[PDB]
Design a protein around this ligand. Structure first.
Ligand SMILES: *[C@@H]1O[C@H](CO)[C@@H](O)[C@H](O)[C@H]1NC(C)=O
Ligand SMILES: *[C@@H]1O[C@H](CO)[C@@H](O)[C@H](O)[C@H]1NC(C)=O
Ligand SMILES: *[C@@H]1O[C@H](CO)[C@@H](O)[C@H](O)[C@H]1NC(C)=O
Lengths: 101, 437, 51
């Protein structure tokens, strides 16, 4: 709740969420506004538009999802390459102990 | 029939229900909360106001003592003065040259205008909802008041409705509340008799017309200095006035969840803070047999220009073929998309348009036209309007809020990582089998 | 020396030692106060109390 005595002409910024915001200006009746998700992007498009749209909607959730999928692909590629390297080692070890084979 | 469903506590935003008995036509059920009242149990401690601190005419005795008698008036202060020489206009007022006793009296009283500008102190123990429900079913309406406690069946003249226990208990008022001219404050006022000067509750009484007024105003009687008569008293300022000057903002401007605080009685009206599980005993006369309802043979839905928002930003056209003309309801089977119209009119080989509000980027939900289920599936665009004047009709879910394209990319990356993991373990198992042989 | 013009009801804290503190409030005669070494604990008891 913010209460302010205002004189002259000014501009006041108020963050409205999905829960809404009710403001009373002077003797006028209260005005209730609800914020609807209108991020500057397209959820059905290229990945960067989806990423910026969801980041403008929820920044921490989008960044932790992006970090999770980046970690998932790095671990997947690294462990797959480790398995390929181990298979190559176990396959070529008998042929590496004999030059004449 | 008995049907239990959970409704949000939002004033307005009617809640959709489709009750479906085994051998009866599906029946619509709109459950709307038109009013709500958190009315707590309040008892009063005292009432306070700006005091009057009337000082009577001082008593004089001349060559004689005036040891003062104790009285039951509010904040009584009697004090004896020696070596005084009283003097009104016209001359010295008594014979005795220097050995005079002056009994100075000072008690305190309510101001004459305390019948309007007074603050009443109350305790708040617990508050229980009393919600007004508009329930319509089978073209029959019912407006009825219920207590949200799980046992009270409300106004069950014909429809028996039990509002089960709400998920969260809010209670916007704290334990101690001050009410002044319709303004409600959470102030930690002192107890009855534990009075503090220069602060709220300095003067207390059980009623405005009550006689047992108690006060601690820190009134001090001073020895007179000038020759003329007067009673010099120094007193702490009114704690009522100090609390008026430092009241902060009342609960009509700072209560959470948008609760409108009203007085006589003290209550919080029209605010949403949880979910009400309502169980309804719908009478069997409301239902009709499935043979009396026009069944559907073929039906297909196409949505057009879906915009997910708080307003009804959908328009789906259902093309149908039916046996016979009649009115029979329609429902949306997902919690993400809710329709606007409950009962539609279906005749034959035609199309009906309907409006829905959704909170998902994808409209992929089941619509039951009069018994038959169809999967409406397309994409919804984000709104161009940033701020709207009506509350959101659907709460957001994590699975719904992610579109098909975003889920496709997410499972694409996850499936790629998992597929490389599986093929790595596969070639490792193949190498182990080769070296084991 | 602390000097302040004050309007309305308010509370003011002042630090006094063994030396003393003399205050004048308006047109009254000055009032002297003296502090004594009454601290929580016990000089004759368990060691943590005296510490
Ligand atoms: C208020 O927010 C707007 C965003 O539309 C911004 O341009 C403006 O500078 C803000 N004003 C203040 C005073 O912060
Ligand atoms: C009390 O009222 C006066 C009136 O001018 C105002 O200046 C002041 O801020 C108020 N509050 C206090 C704590 O003195
Ligand atoms: C004065 O000291 C007391 C000691 O308990 C403390 O509670 C109070 O906040 C102090 N007031 C100021 C204005 O420093």
């Amino acid at each position: 709740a913010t209460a302010e005595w205002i004189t002259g002409t000014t501009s006041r910024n108020f963050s409205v969420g999905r829960e809404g915001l009710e403001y009373v200006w002077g003797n006028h009746e209260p005005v209730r506004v609800w914020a609807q998700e209108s991020a500057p992007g397209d959820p059905h498009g290229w990945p960067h538009e989806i990423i910026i749209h969801y980041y403008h909607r929820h920044p921490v959730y989008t960044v932790i999802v992006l970090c999770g999928v980046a970690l998932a692909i790095l671990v997947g590629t690294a462990s797959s390459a480790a398995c390929i390297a181990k298979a190559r080692r176990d396959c070529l070890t008998p042929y590496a102990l004999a030059p004449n084979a | 029939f008995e049907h239990a469903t959970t409704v949000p506590n939002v004033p307005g935003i009617p809640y959709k229900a489709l009750v479906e008995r085994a051998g009866y036509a599906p029946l619509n059920l709109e459950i709307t909360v038109v009013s709500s009242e958190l009315t707590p149990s309040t008892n009063k401690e005292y009432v306070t106001c700006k005091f009057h601190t009337v000082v009577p005419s001082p008593q004089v005795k001349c060559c004689g003592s005036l040891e003062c008698k104790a009285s039951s008036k509010a904040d009584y202060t009697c004090r004896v003065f020696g070596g005084v020489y009283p003097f009104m206009w016209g001359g010295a007022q008594c014979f005795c040259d220097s050995e005079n006793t002056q009994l100075s009296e000072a008690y305190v009283e309510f101001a004459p205008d305390c019948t309007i500008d007074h603050a009443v102190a109350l305790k708040v123990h617990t508050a229980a909802l009393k919600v007004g429900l508009r329930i319509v079913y089978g073209n029959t309406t019912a407006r009825l008041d219920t207590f949200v406690n799980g046992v009270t069946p409300g106004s069950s003249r014909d429809l028996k409705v039990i509002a089960g226990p709400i998920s969260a208990a809010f209670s916007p008022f704290d334990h101690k509340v001050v009410i002044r001219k319709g303004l409600v404050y959470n102030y930690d006022f002192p107890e009855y008799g534990a009075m503090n000067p220069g602060a709220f509750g300095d003067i207390q009484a059980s009623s405005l017309d009550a006689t047992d007024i108690v006060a601690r105003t820190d009134i001090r009687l001073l020895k007179p200095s000038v020759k003329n008569i007067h009673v010099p008293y120094t007193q702490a300022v009114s704690g009522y006035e100090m609390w008026k000057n430092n009241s902060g903002r009342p609960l009509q401007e700072t209560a959470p969840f948008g609760c409108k605080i009203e007085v006589e009685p003290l209550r919080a009206t029209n605010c949403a803070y949880g979910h009400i599980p309502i169980s309804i005993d719908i009478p069997d006369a409301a239902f009709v047999r499935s043979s009396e309802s026009p069944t559907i043979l073929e039906v297909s839905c196409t949505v057009a220009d879906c915009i997910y928002s708080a307003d009804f930003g959908g328009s789906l056209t259902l093309q149908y073929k039916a046996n016979r003309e009649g009115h029979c309801p329609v429902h949306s089977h997902s919690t993400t998309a809710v329709l606007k119209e409950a009962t539609t009119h279906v005749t034959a080989t035609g199309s009906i348009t309907l409006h829905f509000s959704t909170s998902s980027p994808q409209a992929n939900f089941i619509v039951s036209l009069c018994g038959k289920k169809t999967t409406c599936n397309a994409e919804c665009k984000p709104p161009a309007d940033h701020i709207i004047g009506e509350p959101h009709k659907v709460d957001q879910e994590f699975q719904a809020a992610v579109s098909k394209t975003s889920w496709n990319w997410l499972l694409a990356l996850f499936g790629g990582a998992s597929s490389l993991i599986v093929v790595g373990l596969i070639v490792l198992v193949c190498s182990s089998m080769l070296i084991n042989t």
